[PDB]
Amino acid sequence: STLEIAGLVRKNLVQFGVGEKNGSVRWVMNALGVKDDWLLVPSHAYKFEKDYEMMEFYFNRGGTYYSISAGNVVIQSLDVGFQDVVLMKVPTIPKFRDITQHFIKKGDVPRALNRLATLVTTVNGTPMLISEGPLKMEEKATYVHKKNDGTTVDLTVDQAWRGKGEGLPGMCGGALVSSNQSIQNAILGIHVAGGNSILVAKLVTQEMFQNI
Ligand SMILES: *C[C@H](NC(=O)OCc1ccccc1)C(=O)O
């Protein structure tokens, strides 16, 4: 069911924060553990701020904290070009339950179209189920990202789900879950943008995990 997939997502969601060494942590959004010490996280969380690699990355797992130098996480792309969401290996994180097999297969994408979905996310750790209207797939999705100084950048990704719904700051990094039980309520991807009553999630397929 949607709810049982949501439970698996919830257990693997951690809070992602960034701070200077010896500084205060800025909690930015969610990251989703997928397998071993690998997580999915929107790279827009960190990559557009100055000297990201000199920062400390923080992972809050239910009130237990795991920090690491940004230079010591291994970032892997989902595909060629910029997709925002990346795979990130964090050596200090406890091993995650492998949920990769709950992600949609590339070939099954059409089966999630025109059907409801649920964004399974948190706002700073408080779990939320956010209803999304019948889904469409945008071959190229463009959305705004607001940086720390209030200025904005326009990001474009390949293959992003679009659904009617209401998002709030911090929900990025949550997982979109299909209402379609015939594909076992597959995880469709990762929430990257919200606004104007539209929710955008980068498609993440099972096949993408082959990239390590
Ligand atoms: C949610 C996970 N499920 C999973 O990996 O299913 C794989 C499967 C299930 C049934 C038949 C073939 C393959 C889990 O934690 O098990």
Cα–Cα distance between 82 and 135 in angstroms, integer?
A: 22
- What does the alpha-carbon distance between residue 35 and residue 136 come to, in Å, rounded to a whole number? 28
CA distance 71 to 10: 27
Is 52:182 a contact under the CB 8 Å cutoff?
no
Please provide the CATH number assigned to the domain covering 101-203.
2.40.10.10
Q: How far, in Å, from the CA of 39 to the mean position of ligand 1?
A: 19
Which amino acid type is present at position 169? P
Nearest in space to 158 (alpha carbons), one of 176, 135, 142 = 142
Q: Please provide residue 77's backbone torsions phi and psi, each rounded to the nearest 5 degrees.
A: -75, 150
DSSP assignments along 124-158, one per residue: TTEEEEEEE-S-EEEEEEEEEEE-TTS-EEEEEEE
State this model's resolution in angstroms.
1.4
Tokens for 85, please give them: 């969401």
Residues flanking ligand 1, CB < 6 Å: 8, 99, 101-102
Q: Kindly give the number of the ligand 1 atom that is closest to the alpha carbon of 97.
A: 15
Tell the CATH topology of 1-100+204-212.
Answer: Thrombin, subunit H (2.40.10)
The coordinates were experimentally obtained by: X-ray
Q: Which residues contact 177 (CB under 8 A, 6 or more apart)?
A: 2, 5, 6, 9, 117, 118, 119, 120, 185, 186, 187, 188
The answer to whether 177 and 118 are in contact (CB under 8 A) is: yes
Output Rg (C-alpha) for the chain, integer angstroms. Answer: 16
Q: What single string gives the DSSP state of each residue in the chain?
A: -HHHHHHHHHHHEEEEEEE-TTS--EEEEEEEEEEBTEEEEEGGGTTTSTTGGGSEEEEEETTEEEEEEGGGSEEEESSSS--SEEEEE-TTSPPBP--GGGBPPGGGGGGGTTS-EEEEEEETTEEEEEEE-S-EEEEEEEEEEE-TTS-EEEEEEEEEEEEE----TT-TT-EEEES-GGGTT-EEEEEEEEETTEEEEEE--GGGGGG-
Both tokens of 189, joined, read 């991807």
Measured distance CA(193)–CA(168) in Å, rounded: 9
- 102, 177, 209: residue to mutate for ligand 1 pocket, most atoms within 8 A of CB: 102
CA-closest candidate to residue 117, choices 44, 191, 22, 171: 191
Domain ranges (residues) in the chain = 1-100+204-212, 101-203
Q: Are residues 40 and 190 in contact, defined by beta-carbon separation less than 8 angstroms?
A: yes
Q: Do 1-100+204-212 and 101-203 have matching folds? A: yes
